[PDB]
Design a protein around this ligand. Structure first.
Ligand SMILES: Nc1ncnc2c1ncn2[C@@H]1O[C@H](COP(=O)(O)OP(=O)(O)O)[C@@H](O)[C@H]1O
Ligand SMILES: Nc1ncnc2c1ncn2[C@@H]1O[C@H](COP(=O)(O)OP(=O)(O)O)[C@@H](O)[C@H]1O
Lengths: 213, 213
């Protein structure tokens, strides 16, 4: 069974603001999610310095992007530190985030939406191109769990019994808006990645499906 | 919890014979599995002629090949008719198969292993390149189940609570032998496919993972 939680009020406001913004540089969501993925990977690598065993659940450190055309879904995966159930609830919704209000105020002053990451709330930039998101995570410290949101004021967390097993890490499953399906296309994804992510220490793998001739 | 079943004696013999054979044309396993996939797709299409709703669980009819290097696994998927729990138990092990003994006898006489499909036991050709296999299937008539075998005399069937949800169809998850890892390579898979599968009515999709430059 799923458990429902309430978002901290300001986060709900930020989400409403983002999913509705007519901003023109929506592609920035990928840079923010790849950046978060890279950070999660840095954390497991660092932790492993004094606890090498932590790497064994998934020895390969990578960031992987997988378009799922039929479902109009785009997945951004990492084999980073992952999030336990408590962390999902804590880190993605119930706790007040320092920059949330600050960023919204900056936005009102004329700040570029691209600044979202510098305010520490880059995760929510995903609502620029998706109206729904499932965060599937597996931390060495917990079972695999699914956190889900539709930018509304509440989210759910459910023990994962329906998705592929992740050795360790997180999958951001974005359910793209109908007018943002260009991010399912290989060429588009490739150019967005090359443009704002040249100094990423991990391999960024793009999964492409090609019909055999 | 898993349920264990005994293989019909002759099937166990055939498996032992196949997994141990030093045969030189091992690549034929792909043609046999793609052929089985095509047959499963023919069946759902035919059934849909008088029961169109059966297609809604997965409107796209395809065959998809996905190499998983890290796990040394190769998956052959189809969105065909799928198999219920009873069918997995029945069709893949417990019931005597007409050609089983006939094929082994033909083999002893000097018959080419490639004839396996004409004897109706082409599925087991997978043991030419894999020492273990998981058959994940979802029939519109049942839940998603996992059938698993290591060519031993018994197999297990478990309600699926660990793999990605299949709308409808079957996934043959082959755990490749250490000396058969060439079938994880794109070029190799492509040539094997083009050679013995030109008259397949469905798109055969190859999933490739490429690091972004
Ligand atoms: N891919 C991920 N792996 C692990 N944790 C993540 C991931 N993405 C986001 N988080 C967690 O949720 C929090 C919210 O994300 P975000 O707003 O982008 O924060 P920050 O700007 O600090 O990265 C993060 O601080 C982090 O703890
Ligand atoms: N991809 C599949 N989808 C549905 N059923 C399958 C699939 N592969 C094998 N089967 C089932 O298990 C049986 C055993 O496979 P196989 O030995 O190749 O049989 P056959 O030669 O009749 O195709 C098949 O007759 C079929 O009913």
């Amino acid at each position: 069974a799923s458990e429902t939680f309430e978002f901290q009020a300001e986060i709900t406001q930020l989400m409403s603001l983002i999913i509705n913004t007519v901003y023109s540089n929506k592609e920035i969501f990928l840079r923010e999610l790849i950046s978060n993925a890279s950070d999660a990977l840095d954390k497991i690598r660092y932790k492993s310095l004094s606890d090498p065993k932590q790497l064994e659940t998934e020895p390969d450190l990578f960031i992987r992007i997988t378009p799922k055309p039929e479902q109009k879904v785009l997945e951004i995966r990492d084999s980073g530190i992952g999030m336990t159930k408590a962390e999902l609830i804590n880190n993605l919704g119930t706790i007040a985030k320092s920059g949330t209000k600050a960023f919204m105020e900056a936005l009102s002053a004329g700040a570029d939406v691209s600044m979202i990451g510098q305010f520490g709330v880059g995760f929510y930039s995903l609502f620029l191109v998706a109206d729904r998101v499932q965060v599937i995570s597996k931390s060495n410290d917990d079972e695999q769990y699914i956190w889900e949101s539709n930018a509304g004021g509440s989210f759910t967390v459910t023990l994962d019994e329906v998705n592929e097993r992740i050795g360790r890490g997180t999958i951001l499953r974005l359910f793209l808006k109908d007018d943002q399906l260009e991010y399912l296309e290989e060429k588009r994804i490739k150019e967005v990645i090359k443009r704002h992510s040249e100094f990423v220490a991990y391999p960024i793998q793009l999964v492409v499906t090609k019909e055999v001739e």
